[PDB]
Amino acid sequence: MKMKIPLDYVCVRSGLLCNRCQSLIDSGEVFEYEVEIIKILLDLEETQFKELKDSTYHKAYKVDDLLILLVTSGQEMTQQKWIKIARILQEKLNIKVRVLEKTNSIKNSAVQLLSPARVLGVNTVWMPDGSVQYVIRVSRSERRLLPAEAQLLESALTKIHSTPVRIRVE
């Protein structure tokens, strides 16, 4: 499995971080809790999900009881396989999991992240400070379907896309 910010397989599997990998932890480029996630994924690549070989791990975001993985699917990876891996990650880490394909589309990210809550549509708002906001519309009747507080999901989407994202119920 490829890595946006690579760590050695030996260091990840052992948890004994070499000087390079420890430096990534020390500086904050990678969080220590991510090593555990990568180790699970590498262990799964060996026998359960070889399609991970040319997938990419980008980063993980963890607020409250939700872990979000940002990935690129290899040429044999499928959304259903990611769901299976998400379930394993849920069990081992005792936390909800959403796996997001890295994409330029805020809408496609929001659809994946909020599932099974429906995205009714997305709006663009130009704000007086010269910024541009994207508003994800969801249904009031589907709050129980969101995997975390709408506000946690907004901040996560804002980080992922480095641009302000809001979720608004209607």
Query: What sign results for the dihedral spanned by CA atoms 79, 73, 109, 100?
Result: positive
Residue 68 near Zn ion by CB under 5 A = no
How many whole angstroms separate alpha carbon 161 and alpha carbon 124? 14
How many whole angstroms separate alpha carbon 70 and alpha carbon 58? 5
Would you tell me how many other CB atoms lie within 10 Å of the CB of residue 51?
A: 19
Is 65 among the annotated ligand-binding positions? Answer: no
Residue with tokens 């936390």: 95
CB of 90 to Zn ion, least distance (A): 27
Residue 35 or residue 114: which is nearer to Zn ion going by CB? 35
Residue 131 makes CB contacts below 8 A (sequence gap 6+) with 164
Residue 60 near Zn ion by CB under 5 A = no
Is 129 among the annotated ligand-binding positions? Answer: no
Is 11 among the annotated ligand-binding positions? Answer: yes
Q: Looking only at residues 70 through 129 of this chain, which bind Zn ion when binding is defined by CB under 5 A?
A: none
Residue 167 near Zn ion by CB under 5 A = no
Is 18 among the annotated ligand-binding positions? Answer: yes
Residue 38 near Zn ion by CB under 5 A = no
Residue 3 or residue 11: which is nearer to Zn ion going by CB? 11
Q: Compute φ and ψ for 155, nearest 5 degrees.
A: -60, -40
CB of 92 to Zn ion, least distance (A): 22
Is residue 65 within 8 Å of 35, Cβ to Cβ? no
Rounded to 5°, the CA angle 86-87-89 comes to 65
Residue 8 near Zn ion by CB under 5 A = yes
Query: Would you give the binding string for Zn ion spanning residues 12-31, x where CB under 5 A is met?
Result: ------x-xx----------
The residues binding Zn ion (CB under 5 A) are 8, 11, 18, 20-21
- Output the known binding site for Zn(2+): 8, 11, 18, 21
